[PDB]
Write a protein that binds this ligand. Sequence first.
Ligand code: HEM
Ligand code: HEM
Ligand code: HEM
Ligand code: HEM
Ligand SMILES: *Cc1cc(OC)ccc1OCc1cccc(CO)n1
Ligand SMILES: *Cc1cc(OC)ccc1OCc1cccc(CO)n1
Lengths: 141, 141, 146, 146
Amino acid sequence: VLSPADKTNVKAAWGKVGAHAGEYGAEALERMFLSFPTTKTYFPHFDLSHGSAQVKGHGKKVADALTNAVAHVDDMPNALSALSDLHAHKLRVDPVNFKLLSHCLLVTLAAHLPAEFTPAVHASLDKFLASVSTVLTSKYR
Amino acid sequence: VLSPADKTNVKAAWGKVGAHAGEYGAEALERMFLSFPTTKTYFPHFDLSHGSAQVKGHGKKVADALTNAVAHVDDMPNALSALSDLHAHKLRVDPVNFKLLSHCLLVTLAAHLPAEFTPAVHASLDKFLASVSTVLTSKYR
Amino acid sequence: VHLTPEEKSAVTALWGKVNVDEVGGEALGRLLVVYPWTQRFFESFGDLSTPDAVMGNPKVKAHGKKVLGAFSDGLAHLDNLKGTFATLSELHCDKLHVDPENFRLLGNVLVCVLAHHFGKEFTPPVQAAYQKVVAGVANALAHKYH
Amino acid sequence: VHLTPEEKSAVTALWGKVNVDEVGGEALGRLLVVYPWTQRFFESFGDLSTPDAVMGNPKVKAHGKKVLGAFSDGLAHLDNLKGTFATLSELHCDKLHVDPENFRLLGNVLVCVLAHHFGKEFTPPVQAAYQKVVAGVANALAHKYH
Ligand code: HEM
Ligand code: HEM
Ligand code: HEM
Ligand code: HEM
Ligand SMILES: *Cc1cc(OC)ccc1OCc1cccc(CO)n1
Ligand SMILES: *Cc1cc(OC)ccc1OCc1cccc(CO)n1
């Protein structure tokens, strides 16, 4: 459950990401694949080589989804319904994996936007990603 | 995130508790205190001996809070704000302890309402308690 | 794991009444239903599309029986769970790469199933004793990780 | 005993640039701010009521320095993290009863702090190496639980 300050912090920090969302999305995925190799098994037919065009494209997909979630932080279940169908119903992604990607997203943010990554914003972004992960790993249809 | 089905499953099942609220709530606590001793550290001022009248009374408050949660399943953050202030702001209970109590509540329900504890109902009850747990451990004000 | 002689007797008395044909399958089945992502490890088990499908699945019941048997062996060697589960640990950790938290989940699902089958006979003291056992088994399974 | 020759070189090289008086305090401070329930273990540390209060608390900064010192001890003995943290494991598990999940969280907060300080220098390969270190430190500390 996000506080008003959390919502404020998420929107401001993600806004600062701006046009780099796709770039950061891809970096977070690469960090996850390299740091936690087991996560690659969820993408059996992907070209996960470094600099992969496919991973670049997927990073943009992931980033755009988060942008959408940020715009509907008060109505995520409805906004991310289709993504939940995919991750929870079809892929049945183990929730531990969402913690891994959530952590890599934070590492990516901290590596690119140091001035924005304050303890308070860090805390807010963590809750937000945990919230998003909860929605995507739950079957609520 | 609970589905319309989870909500109806929880209402039907928990609805069977009825006048057994205090009994089941007390039993769930006793099971937690006995199975996971570390949980007792949150109740240093309590008489935690078995049969304890203090535990019996507290068991009733816990059961009644759950009944209230079931009734406000669509707006738990709002309905449980007072309890969140208590468990997340004041007591700062480690979330792992909520998983333990949730497990013990499921055990108590299974031991008393075998007909109600179907696999699907078991799944819903688990998600419901995880949901209540999240609200009680989040600082959203 | 350290079980008082009174706890050992209580645990053993209960376990001797367990339906070895159904308990294991209901535990594994509930695991798959309550934590659906665990289904990803049983691709070849056929139909797991619905709760009834999972619970009645012949392969689920048969595999759950093996799981139950592993717990029975664990109860027979509480003084040496790490060695008893060495083989199984290599399998679940090095090969399958099962996240440790899932071992804990199954252990507790089993506890819920025992509670379901024995009702009031599954008292708080008996449960506490079983919690020590499942924690012990869960730990032993994930030791190849440590 | 895990960890490749190249990962060790990467960890050692980056660590030689880490400010031992700051990073630990920043990591502990953030742990307390991001996962508020951890504040309960530091009741005597004073004001922890706000992010600024936490990050400015001298006791938090001082303790973080000891924590970082321990991480350094581990990095100097990467093949024996179990032994390096044996005593600390007794304290955190037997005495303080800190749930092991918290050890993992501190490890990842440390990683976030390293990323924050090093920026581009904290490359995916460097992070992967560090994930192995913190996972090993976390498991070593939870040893008394195994
Ligand atoms: C912050 C959390 C996450 C977000 C916002 C997210 C978002 C997305 C989006 C936008 C897609 C594209 C859907 C489409 O093709 O229409 C996708 C696909 C996918 N995601 Fe995620 N995801 C998240 C975490 C994860 C995690 C942790 C895993 C597993 C380690 C995962 C596994 C997959 C897979 C396997 C696909 C499908 C790839 C394919 O086309 O074969 N996702 N995700
Ligand atoms: C979702 C499950 C839980 C529910 C619904 C719940 C509900 C409640 C309720 C209704 C009260 C009484 C508040 C009042 O009227 O003043 C309470 C108090 C308390 N709870 Fe919980 N609780 C839950 C989980 C936990 C856990 C996991 C712990 C710790 C292991 C815990 C520790 C406490 C303590 C220490 C008190 C204060 C008792 C006192 O001093 O009077 N609770 N809880
Ligand atoms: C913690 C309690 C557990 C026990 C005691 C247990 C026990 C067993 C046993 C006895 C076997 C058969 C090994 C053989 O015949 O060589 C087995 C296999 C297996 N287990 Fe577990 N298990 C546990 C948890 C898990 C969990 C949590 C998962 C994952 C969600 C899992 C996934 C598997 C898989 C995929 C197999 C292989 C089945 C096949 O394809 O033949 N196990 N387990
Ligand atoms: C995983 C990495 C960790 C390391 C390397 C570490 C290291 C240390 C060290 C070196 C000490 C000083 C021991 C002494 O001289 O008495 C200590 C004390 C302590 N640690 Fe940790 N620790 C870790 C995680 C945690 C976590 C996650 C918590 C709890 C959330 C925690 C809570 C404490 C407490 C309460 C003390 C005693 C503080 C006092 O003196 O009041 N530690 N730790
Ligand atoms: C608020 C929140 C916190 C955590 O842990 C930090 C996990 C999940 C979560 O909420 C997910 C969420 C968001 C919106 C709506 C619903 C259910 O209607 N759940
Ligand atoms: C739906 C749900 C599932 C889990 O399982 C991990 C945890 C938490 C959660 O939802 C919490 C919740 C409930 C109601 C409203 C909100 C935020 O408005 N969060």
